[PDB]
């Protein structure tokens, strides 16, 4: 319990003081030079945020991690999907989740995500 968050978890913001804690952790490690973990943590709280610029910053931090940590790349595709989805970029979200789905046809979390993305795409076009 449990490998990824739910899309629902993605829509529950942290309390401001929780987000600030995650920010101060990255500050304490030098910002750009912070650990992958501490940066992911802050990025995930930013993705959860109802502020569009926070969400963009979270996605940006996640693409950094994707670029720099090959071992983390499959894992980051899941977050990049949710990020783009919250941002209205469903074409990008479909792309990411398709890659990820090619590596896990049997994972129920991914198929749940994939389904949401394609339901949204369906609904919006139309």
């Amino acid at each position: 319990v449990d490998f990824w968050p739910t899309l629902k978890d993605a829509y529950e913001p942290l309390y401001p003081q929780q987000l600030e804690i995650l920010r101060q952790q990255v500050v304490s490690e030098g910002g750009p030079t912070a650990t992958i973990q501490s940066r992911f943590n802050y990025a995930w709280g930013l993705i959860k945020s109802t502020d569009v610029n926070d969400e963009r910053l979270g996605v940006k931090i996640l693409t950094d991690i994707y670029k720099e940590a090959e071992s983390r790349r499959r894992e980051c595709l899941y977050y990049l999907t949710i990020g783009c989805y919250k941002l209205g970029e469903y074409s990008m979200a479909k792309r990411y989740v398709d890659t990820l789905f090619e590596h896990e046809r049997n994972n129920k979390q991914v198929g749940a995500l994939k389904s949401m993305v394609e339901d949204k795409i369906q609904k919006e076009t139309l």
Partner: peptide
């Protein structure tokens, strides 16, 4: 390897414990 999300779920309860 233990997930990023798993590391995140560990971090915040402990950080909040540290607050005074």
């Amino acid at each position: 390897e233990t997930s990023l999300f798993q590391g995140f779920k560990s971090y915040l309860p402990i950080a909040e414990l540290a607050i005074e």
